[PDB]
Nucleic acid binder design. Structure first.
Ligand SMILES: [Zn+2]
Lengths: 365, 64, 781, 250
DNA sequence: CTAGTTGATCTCATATCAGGAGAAGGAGCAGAGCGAATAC
């Protein structure tokens, strides 16, 4: 590493080299945090986490008990040991608390003054973070499994919602229009994710073992349907062209948005060319998941090699996205891990699981 | 008396399964969807409705 | 909010790109040299180079290539900036007036994307149908040229290979054909595509992928008579044309990797190749009646460590260097009796990577003097800089200098240096450490291819001769150096922080702080202290030694027994790389937490974290301007000033100033090169620029700001790049406008405009008042 | 020639003939074509909506934008009483379009299936009646139509009529309606028209009714409780801005 | 050939406890029987 510092000082290597190499080294040295703790307030398992995209300071967490906790991740104390204190809380005494489990919570991109939370109580609530009051509510005829706002859209502000209905809802936060729907799936839509690269590209994964990419501006259904075999087993499109041999319960675009990682209940993760949905045949081995709802997993950013952190039983499996090589198992949870969210500023990880714990993984040394 | 119950946490109908371990006098109710689990003591007169009852009561008590 | 004035005392001198062609006139042979922000246009005369223009781009020139579209009388220049400002420029001379008109311009920054490891690549189709940019992994941006744009509209073609090493356009292909080397887990392969502008997509290349050398790192597009390409790797040179597969493995190129090339002849019968060790080779293509017969490589000789090189004519080669002085060398037909055909005609000074520098009032005048550790392995040297224009002496060390400190009592400089030995070990050349008057080696009881040997050079501060050269332990890297007297004894010591470097580990676990005293022309080891990590930085702190072992900033006291005893530690750092001091306060520059205002409370005897900045800036240097202003340099070429704000929120340092310098600042230092503004902080950069930061007053800063906006409205940039965008604080995960910083170069350009333009600037005091103000601003450097 | 942002060279000697609102309508139609969505030229009668359509399609053919080198086969479904008018309009604005009528009167004098095949094979401009769409709904929809223009598209106002189903059996993204009034009786007709032009934008008709039609009409009575009228106003605003970028009505 | 009249037919639109008996399935237990698996 002194070689890295010397090369940076002498201009031999771009500082990009040191930055991404050290980010990768930090991610590889991920371990149970020696001096850090997260305050425990959820009475039930944490189903979702979200660190705000700008300044990466505050973290939302939705629990199976319906409460939403807002934590400050910064060590505002002077000690090396600190607990991520809870700033705010939609608790059981809040007038607008979710009646059932909160399954997805997401900070509004471009601004930390608002966030959103969808629950199995058939509601997508939009909260003002300052007053901590519901600015809006969208009701659905069937329970919400996931939702996502575009991390890129300066123009549109649509929330793509996947419920147990076979339709992907698009709720306009600009003047409230939840009527827009996308047809083409056949069972519950367990995951939805906007492309970080393209403004109007949305990937939706449903229990019909299919993943569809939509240009929501378009009037002609999905753009691409992901196919495991890319055409080896080709059939007229009524039941073929499946992404997995089970329910596809998780989506994640890579950092650049040029590839898509789909995890399904066939104990398989697959990497897809996001421009034509071709399977890249990256192996990843066996990725154990049996979740009946959406599975939240994230990818690394700002590193020499991209990593993907997938909940794997009661562990976090870290894989290399483009080679599939298994990095490691982060092993500190006592029950199945529901979500993991990656802090890209310091290569940190926060994992929420059914054991009512949010565990922080920090690079060692 | 129904054996499958709506989950108080995710509101999914008939998603809760009840297991009566009589040998240990414990009933375990688990939601298949949101994976919420609850364990209560049971007697030989107990039924899945009683286990779901204890779960609802524990939820309301903990939410005070 | 803070008020700062940044001005370039010395313009950047390191050449990061050089291209030749007919830019100024159809008959002129121009040499365009890209120093970091400066584009220098020379005309290649029969002797030397005649400078015809020097323009200052609002951008770091990452790409610079000349191309002649069909029907164009003379070459157009394509420049891409590090912030992805693309511009096509034309040279228009109207008598005395010289103008670089922006024929086209645009910004090609993708909103998201992983910037490629091997860096920005820019190529132009040999028939000038398009510009191909590799800016991000997995993408290949294309700017069509047949569609004559004035906005440089571009489109991305998805490239299935995500780790592309190098790419070129092939010659003699009916369609724009790219040949590129890429890395996949199976190895490195060279593949070809044919780009289609109509279908906006790749098509199957003329010849299929071929598995190339593991370190195949360079692609050279051979001209039409041969066609195809040449791939240069660490160990072999191969030539592919689709069915011709020539290969050589010259043992003479094995010792160092080839990093640059240039085509000597228009038909590519000869190429120049520079290595990192400075060796210059000629690669000859032997033709047979045309196809290619056989490849030969012959060592022409040795030059400066060449970032780039360009054959001008008549055996003259411009060797543009980033690590040393640029050269204009002559390729003789016959050897010089030492096996070398290269003869240096001219040397252009280059303050290389200014890793460290000290301001000294040598000769006991009132004038400062910068002594800078400039350059690298073979081009390492000391540069002494004064105001006389700036006069620059050079003291070649022939080894990389790392740190420098002045010991006034001993009348010498302590310079940390590093040389490469190949084998027990053998020096590759006679370096300044080996040419000392006297020498010594450390015999420490604490610890018991090519390697770096680190030395402490005691250099006489009159003659700049190496009075002494103390070699350190085997596999020991000296990182920090400070000249100070500790405790209460009167002796002044050279205190050197070191680290034990072995290949088996990523972070040093061992190191020591060695206290030397230089007296009677000898360097006696006064004291040692085994510490458990690399001592990245040390500073004298109120008579004590404040050191930074890997993540711990700790304080040592100098006892009556002349040994170092720990007094206090602070552990809340990732790695404390940079340490500064003013009073009881310490400023800890961290690798990625970016600052920490620490305070040593003497009434108790420990540190206290007064404040911190929680933004994740990766640091290169740090300094303390005032009692409550803290200057810091981020590795993304930005300056930022943090301020102690005015509860726990008081522990948050507020970034009150932001600025994009465009240079990698390596060192700050209080001082000035001269005999209205408060303070003076000189800084040294990687591309050789020396700059100067001063604090301004509020009203004056506001007035200056106003002048900056007016000049931006008046002065026209070369690539039509907005000055605010150029100076906007930029990082891969953040982008903000410049605040709290005045661009001194732009203000000082107020002199170089005609009076009507001044009146345009000063539409809403008189112009003469502002001329006086800018003159006074120029006085400080 | 007038040029748009991405490049859509509407010819100058046609574009100059249009009026300002007509040129705005051509701009709007081509924005839809870039978004690959449909719309409703809901301009009331007498402004001239056929002129806008022929001008836009002529520009799309000359501009050679591309799938298809320029404009492909398009079908215009209009009432019989105006079919001949349409061909004359084309023949006076943009002659080189091989426009053809599908009718018993017609001009083909052979099998009509051969007319569909021949016209599609030449990327022609084919005009039908709504009845022919209904009757040959399986045959006419096999030749990859690039545009579908339902002139007087209020024939689709009923979401139950066989003409509605036959017209919604087309596959192209490009669906334009030329109707003087998108809705005539109630919001069933607005929903049907929007289900034509853009299948997914407004929800399924049950959802649409239960969200929009009942609250609006309940707030259309003067004895409504204040909450009812305020909800009706809000829901009307939501429907308005949802349909704003796809109904051009002047 | 060739247009105009005559009937049929379809679409569409206008509001407001005092049975019993037997056969088919599934359930849980009980054991038999054989493969592997320690182990003397
Ligand atoms: Zn549940």
């Amino acid at each position: 590493m002194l070689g890295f510092l010397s090369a940076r000082q002498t201009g031999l290597e771009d500082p990009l080299r040191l930055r991404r190499a050290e980010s990768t080294r930090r991610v590889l040295g991920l371990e149970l945090n020696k001096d850090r703790d997260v305050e425990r307030i959820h009475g039930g398992g944490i189903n979702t986490l979200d660190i705000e995209p700008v300044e990466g300071r505050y973290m939302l967490s939705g629990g199976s008990d319906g409460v939403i906790v807002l934590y400050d991740l910064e060590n505002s104390s002077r000690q090396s040991y600190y607990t991520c204190k809870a700033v705010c809380s939609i608790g059981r005494d809040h007038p607008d608390v979710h009646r059932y489990s909160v399954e997805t919570v997401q900070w509004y991109p471009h601004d930390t003054g608002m966030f959103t939370s969808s629950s199995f109580d058939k509601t997508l609530k939009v909260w003002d973070t300052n007053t901590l009051q519901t600015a809006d509510v969208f009701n659905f005829e069937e329970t919400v499994y996931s939702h996502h706002m575009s991390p890129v859209s300066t123009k549109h502000c649509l929330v793509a919602v996947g419920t147990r209905g076979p339709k992907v809802q698009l709720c306009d936060l600009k003047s409230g229009s939840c009527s827009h729907i996308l047809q083409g799936h056949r069972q519950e839509i367990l995951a939805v994710s906007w492309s970080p690269r393209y403004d109007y590209i949305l990937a939706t994964a449903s229990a019909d073992s299919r993943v569809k990419l939509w240009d929501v501006r378009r009037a002609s259904g999905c753009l691409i349907t992901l196919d495991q075999h890319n055409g080896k087993k080709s059939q007229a499109v009524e039941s073929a062209n499946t992404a997995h041999n089970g329910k596809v319960n998780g989506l994640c675009f890579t950092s650049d948005g040029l590839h898509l990682l789909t995890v399904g209940t066939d104990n398989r993760m697959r990497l897809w060319n996001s421009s034509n949905g071709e399977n890249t045949l990256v192996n990843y081995g066996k990725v154990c998941n049996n979740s009946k709802k959406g599975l939240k997993f994230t990818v690394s950013c700002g590193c020499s090699s991209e990593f993907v952190f997938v909940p794997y039983g009661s562990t976090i499996a870290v894989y290399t996205v483009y080679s599939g090589e298994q990095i490691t198992m982060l092993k500190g949870h006592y029950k199945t891990v529901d979500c993991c969210v990656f802090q890209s500023n310091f290569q940190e990880l926060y994992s929420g699981s059914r054991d009512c714990n949010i565990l922080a993984w920090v690079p060692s040394l | 008396l129904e054996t499958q119950f709506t989950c108080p946490f995710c509101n999914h109908e008939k998603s809760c399964d009840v297991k009566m371990d009589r040998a240990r006098n414990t009933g375990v109710i688990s939601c298949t969807v949101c994976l919420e689990e609850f364990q209560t003591p049971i007697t030989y007169l107990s039924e899945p409705v009683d286990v779901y009852s204890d779960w609802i009561d524990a939820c309301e008590a903990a939410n005070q | 909010m803070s008020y700062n004035y940044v001005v370039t005392a010395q313009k950047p001198t390191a050449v990061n790109g050089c291209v030749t062609g007919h830019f100024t006139s159809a008959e002129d042979l121009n040499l365009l040299i890209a120093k970091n922000t400066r584009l220098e246009i020379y005309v290649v005369t029969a002797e030397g180079l005649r400078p015809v223009k020097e323009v200052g781009m609002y951008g770091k020139i990452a790409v610079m290539e000349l191309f002649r579209p069909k029907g164009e009388s003379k070459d157009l220049l394509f420049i891409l900036t590090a912030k992805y400002n693309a511009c096509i420029l034309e040279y228009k001379q109207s008598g005395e007036s010289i103008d670089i008109i922006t024929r086209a311009h645009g910004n090609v920054q993708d909103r998201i994307g992983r910037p490629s490891e091997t860096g920005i690549i820019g190529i132009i189709d040999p028939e000038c149908r398009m510009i191909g940019l590799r800016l991000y992994d997995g993408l290949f941006k294309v700017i069509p040229l047949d569609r004559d744009n004035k906005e440089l509209k571009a489109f991305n073609i998805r490239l299935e290979e995500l780790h592309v090493i190098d790419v070129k356009f092939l010659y003699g292909c009916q369609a724009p054909t790219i040949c590129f080397v890429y890395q996949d887990p199976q190895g490195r392969h060279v593949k070809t595509y044919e780009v289609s502008l109509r279908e906006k997509e790749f098509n199957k290349g003329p010849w299929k992928q071929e598995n190339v050398e593991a370190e195949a790192s360079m692609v050279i597009a051979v001209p039409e008579p041969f066609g195809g390409a040449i791939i240069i790797g660490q160990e072999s040179i191969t030539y592919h044309n689709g069915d011709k597969y020539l290969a050589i493995a010259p043992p003479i190129i094995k010792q160092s990797t080839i990093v640059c090339h240039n085509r000597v002849d228009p038909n590519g019968s000869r190429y120049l190749l520079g290595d990192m060790e400075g060796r210059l080779f000629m690669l000859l293509l032997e033709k047979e009646e045309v196809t290619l017969k056989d490849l030969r490589v012959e060592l022409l000789g040795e030059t400066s460590i060449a970032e780039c090189l360009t054959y001008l004519d008549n055996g003259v080669v411009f060797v543009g260097s980033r690590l040393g002085d640029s050269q204009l060398v002559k390729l003789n037909v016959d050897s010089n009796e030492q096996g070398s055909y290269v003869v240096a005609m001219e040397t252009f000074t280059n303050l290389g990577p200014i890793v460290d520098m000290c301001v000294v009032d040598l000769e006991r005048q009132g004038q400062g003097q910068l002594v800078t550790c400039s350059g690298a392995f073979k081009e390492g040297s000391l540069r002494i800089i004064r105001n006389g224009k700036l006069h620059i002496r050079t003291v070649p060390l022939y080894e990389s200098p790392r740190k420098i400190c002045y010991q006034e009592v001993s009348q010498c400089f302590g310079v940390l240096s590093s040389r490469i030995e190949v084998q027990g070990t053998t020096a590759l050349r006679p370096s300044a450490s080996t040419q000392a008057l006297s020498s010594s080696v450390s015999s420490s009881k604490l610890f018991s291819e090519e390697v770096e040997v680190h030395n402490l050079l005691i250099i006489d501060q009159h003659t700049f001769e190496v009075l002494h050269a103390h070699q350190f332990l085997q596999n020991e890297y000296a990182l920090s150096l400070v000249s100070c007297k500790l405790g209460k004894d009167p002796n002044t010591y050279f205190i050197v922080g070191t680290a034990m470097v072995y290949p088996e580990e990523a972070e040093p676990k061992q190191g020591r702080i060695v206290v030397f005293q230089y007296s009677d022309g000898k360097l006696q080891t006064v004291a040692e202290k085994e510490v458990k990590g690399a001592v990245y930085s040390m500073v004298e702190f109120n008579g004590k030694l404040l050191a930074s072992i890997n993540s711990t900033v700790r304080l040592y006291e100098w006892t009556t027994e002349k040994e170092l005893r720990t007094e206090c530690n602070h552990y809340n750092n990732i790695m404390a790389l940079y340490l500064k001091t003013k009073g009881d306060f310490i400023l800890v520059g961290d690798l990625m937490r970016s600052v920490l205002l620490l305070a040593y409370k003497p009434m108790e005897g420990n540190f206290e974290e007064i404040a911190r900045d929680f933004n994740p800036n990766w640091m290169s240097a740090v300094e303390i301007l005032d009692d409550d202003n803290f200057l810091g340099a981020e590795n993304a070429f930005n300056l930022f000033v943090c301020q102690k704000d005015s509860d726990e929120e008081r522990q948050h340092l507020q970034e009150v100033g932001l600025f994009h310098l465009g240079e990698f600042v390596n060192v700050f230092c209080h001082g000035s090169l001269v005999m209205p503004t408060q303070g003076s902080v000189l800084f040294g950069t990687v591309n050789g620029m020396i700059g100067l930061v001063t604090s301004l007053s509020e009203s004056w800063y506001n007035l200056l700001l106003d002048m900056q906006n007016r000049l931006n409205k008046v002065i026209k940039s070369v690539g039509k790049i907005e000055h605010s965008f150029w100076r906007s604080f930029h990082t891969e995960r953040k982008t903000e406008p410049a605040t709290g910083f005045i661009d001194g170069d732009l203000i000082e350009s107020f002199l170089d405009i005609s009076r009507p333009k001044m009146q345009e600037v000063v539409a809403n005091a008189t112009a003469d008042d502002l001329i006086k103000v800018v003159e006074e601003l120029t006085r400080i450097h | 020639d007038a040029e748009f942002d991405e490049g859509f060279k509407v010819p100058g000697f046609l574009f100059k003939k249009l009026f300002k609102y007509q040129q705005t309508g051509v701009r709007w139609l081509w924005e839809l074509h870039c978004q690959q969505a449909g719309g409703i030229l809901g301009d009331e009668m007498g402004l001239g909506k056929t002129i806008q359509i022929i001008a836009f399609l002529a520009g799309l053919s000359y501009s050679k934008i591309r799938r298809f080198e320029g404009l492909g086969p398009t079908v215009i479904v209009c009432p019989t009483t105006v079919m001949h008018q349409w061909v004359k309009e084309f023949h006076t604005w943009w002659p080189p379009f091989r426009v053809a009528i599908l009718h018993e009167t017609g001009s083909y004098t052979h099998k009509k299936e051969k007319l569909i095949r021949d016209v599609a094979h030449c990327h022609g401009i084919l005009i039908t009646s709504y009845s022919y769409i209904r009757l040959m709904q399986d045959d006419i929809s096999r030749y990859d139509w690039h545009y579908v223009i339902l002139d007087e598209g209020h024939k689709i106002r009923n979401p139950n009529a066989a003409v509605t189903l036959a017209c919604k059996q087309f596959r192209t993204p490009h669906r334009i309606i030329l109707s003087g009034s998108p809705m005539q009786n109630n919001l069933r007709e607005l929903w049907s028209l929007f289900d034509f032009i853009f299948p997914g934008k407004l929800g399924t008709l049950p959802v649409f009714m239960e969200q929009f039609s009942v609250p609006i009409t309940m707030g259309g009575y003067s004895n409504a409780s204040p909450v009812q009228v305020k909800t009706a106003y809000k829901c009307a605003c939501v429907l308005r801005d949802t349909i704003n970028p796809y109904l051009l009505r002047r």
